[PDB]
A paper describes a structure:
The adenosine-to-inosine (A-to-I) editing in anticodons of tRNAs is critical for wobble base-pairing during translation. This modification is produced via deamination on A34 and catalyzed by the adenosine deaminase acting on tRNA (ADAT) enzyme. By contrast, in eukaryotic organisms like yeasts, ADAT is a heterodimer formed by ADAT2 and ADAT3 (the ScADAT2/3 heterodimer). ADAT2 is the catalytic subunit, and ADAT3 serves only a structural role, because the essential glutamate in the conserved H(C) XE motif of the latter is usually mutated to a catalytically inactive residue (a valine in the ScADAT3 case).
In this study, we determined a crystal structure of the ScADAT2/3 heterodimer to 2.8 Å and revealed the assembly of the eukaryotic ADAT enzymes. There are two ScADAT2 (chains A and B) and two ScADAT3 copies (chains C and D) in the asymmetric unit, forming two heterodimers. The ScADAT2 and ScADAT3 subunits of the heterodimer make substantial contacts, exclusively through the ScADAT2-CD/ScADAT3-PCD interface, burying a total surface area of 2010 Å2. Like SaTadA, the active site of ScADAT2 comprised a zinc ion coordinated by four ligands: His54, Cys88, Cys91, and a water molecule. Importantly, while the C-terminal half of ScADAT3 forms a pseudo-catalytic domain (PCD), resembling TadA, the eukaryote-specific N-terminal sequence forms a stand-alone domain and functions as a tRNA-binding domain. We also discovered the zinc-binding site in ScADAT3, which is coordinated by four ligands: His216, Cys254, Cys257, and Cys322. Surprisingly, we found that the tRNA entrance into PCD is blocked by ScADAT3 itself.
Numbering used by the authors:
A (entry chain C): 8 to 74, 84 to 88, 95 to 105, 122 to 322
B (entry chain A): -1 to 165, 178 to 244
Write the structure that this text describes.
Amino acid sequence: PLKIDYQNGIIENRLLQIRNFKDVNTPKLINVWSIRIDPRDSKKVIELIRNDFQKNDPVSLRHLKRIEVVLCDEGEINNKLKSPEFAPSTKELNNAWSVKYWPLIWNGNPNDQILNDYKIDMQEVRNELSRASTLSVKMATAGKQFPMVSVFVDPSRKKDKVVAEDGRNCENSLPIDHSVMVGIRAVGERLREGVDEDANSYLCLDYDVYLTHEPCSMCSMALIHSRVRRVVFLTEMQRTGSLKLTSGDGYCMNDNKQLNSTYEAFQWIGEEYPVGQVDRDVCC
Amino acid sequence: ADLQHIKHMRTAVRLARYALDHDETPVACIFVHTPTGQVMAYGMNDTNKSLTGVAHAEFMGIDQIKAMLGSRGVVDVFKDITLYVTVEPCIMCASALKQLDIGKVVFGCGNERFGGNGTVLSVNHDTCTLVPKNNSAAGYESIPGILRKEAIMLLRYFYVRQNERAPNTFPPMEWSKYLNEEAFIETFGDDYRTCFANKVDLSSNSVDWDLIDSHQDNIIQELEEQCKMFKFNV
Ligand SMILES: [Zn+2]
Ligand SMILES: [Zn+2]
């Protein structure tokens, strides 16, 4: 469906994929929970360890050349009664890691499969971004000193999108009352009220969030705790931003292997949706 | 290894124990006004009630102070505050505390997955998280390892308890993530100094079982009286 520039990770000339490259060079290992057998057993075990061990493991071990074989104690040997947490980016890195820790299946840059699997509604993206931006300029025009917006869309798209202005414009505000935080609290209070939320509503799980400004370290991590699916932002904050590799200290909080959790992140790199000028030292 | 630190962390651990017994994660806060030695606020994890993933102990205590002192109050007093937490602030809390310009953090055990005072990030000494008054980032110190065993044990209790629903060996302490050998020995004694920073091991030799095994149902009322005393001293 979508025009993808695999060279630069730009979708439809407008959405710039945000992720980390420094950290994709190093390997984050595991121990070998192995199994030793002879080839006749191999074909029978690879069936068993195929259907469950792939279908059930929370880790994704599909980049491992499993043949000297490892399924993934009780449930393990009951079924067995019948008889790099992460892929590398270069072929060179694949061969080296193959010999260093375990043979791996090389299938090109794994980021190519990521870009391809990105399910994106280009018009929805444009809409929400248009909305956040129009509010942003209104706020600035009104004299408001923190013209930042966050818009929280829920997974179904059936609930009312939550629109959250930065709180530092308000009377009794703290420096930490940023728009992502406000919108998170709003979603929470909507769950708490319980009028428009199922008993399978949880946090901001699989919400998409649209920001005028790249979020600070608190906000980035805040969206990690809220288990959002996607963030799309407009203005990079080199001094304070916590998503882009070149922003801040390169936290790249959406894409940090040391946390158990990630979300997809994009910047809009067109000029369609101008926003309120913010001081560059501002966190958010 | 200052003794006010033991004292106040003991309080934090009592509160975390209370949290455990009310089915909540045993992360708990005691905000102490360093110039007076007074307890000014407290916190527990509150994500069961809030239904958000952001209602962490530190946040609860920030609200209490905002309620006691107002926004101006919070911002003004905060540089005078020593925070005591059983678990290292997560990146999100470490960042909020940075922006509010906290005096100092003392914590027990590291936060293996989200720790933002050294374990995963060092937000407290970063350059992208600023104090807005003067857009600065001088930072705050975060003292690790005070009742580390106790914090770890409370977490283990929680993990076990969590499983009750409808169908010693403590890890090596990577101290060099939170301070340099010189900063270690300024923080701790020269005897405990050398040996502990060197072998990646914990400051203590036995787990305080009574502290972590006994309930603290009055803890809220105790902290309430103490907090209101601080309020009348303001
Ligand atoms: Zn923020
Ligand atoms: Zn936290």
